Write a protein that binds this ligand. Sequence first.
Ligand code: N1G
Ligand code: ZN
Ligand code: ZN
Length: 229
Amino acid sequence: GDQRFGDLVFRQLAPNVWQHTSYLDMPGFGAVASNGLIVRDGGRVLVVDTAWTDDQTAQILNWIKQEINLPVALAVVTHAHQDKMGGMDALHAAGIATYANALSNQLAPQEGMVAAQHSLTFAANGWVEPATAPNFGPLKVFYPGPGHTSDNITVGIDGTDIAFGGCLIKDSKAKSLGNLGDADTEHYAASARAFGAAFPKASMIVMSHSAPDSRAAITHTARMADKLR
Ligand SMILES: O=C(Nc1nnn[nH]1)c1cc(-c2ccccc2)n(-c2ccccc2)n1
Ligand SMILES: [Zn+2]
Ligand SMILES: [Zn+2]
């Protein structure tokens, strides 16, 4: 059910949830898909992650205008790397309130990202402090611990079977953990497992660089991360 819209792809995952996909291409390597989410929550829309670029992110908003035609109340971005935060300026130009882990906003300038406008903080159990995530509706934001990066966060969608691992989680047949240049090799495995335990009823696991998968994505990612120690 892939819907092509310019250079982006949208796939409906639930009556009110879509995966957005955008592409970046470099020499010597194939084009890399990056996935985020779009959620219709009643009379408003919520976005998880930008596309790689401002232009692509503006196209996400154009697709939302054409197919949903409701205001985008907020966006949450899941770590301070280009695939998740490269299009922040497009969100801000559109007047959308933006949220990220406080640590992502701390890292953003050095990483070459524009910071989100608002910082999330997290309790010791990993769940976002609700006072820092006003009006998040069905988005349930969880910091699983350091893994792909020190700041990576994850998001479940209440009322659905969906949980989003961002770049932390790879699919059940993945042959690598991707870019580990910023990774926490000691804690990756526990963080992957903590994500699974935070959303134990989610049967559809969505992630940055593979199509949606079963919970075997979580077990397989953790088993690969076991070898990093
Ligand atoms: O973030 C990444 N990867 C990941 N995420 N989670 N685990 N690994 C990731 C990937 C890539 C990439 C994009 C196209 C071809 C090859 C590589 N660039 C990238 C971005 C800008 C310039 C050069 C590379 N960044
Ligand atoms: Zn990353
Ligand atoms: Zn990534």
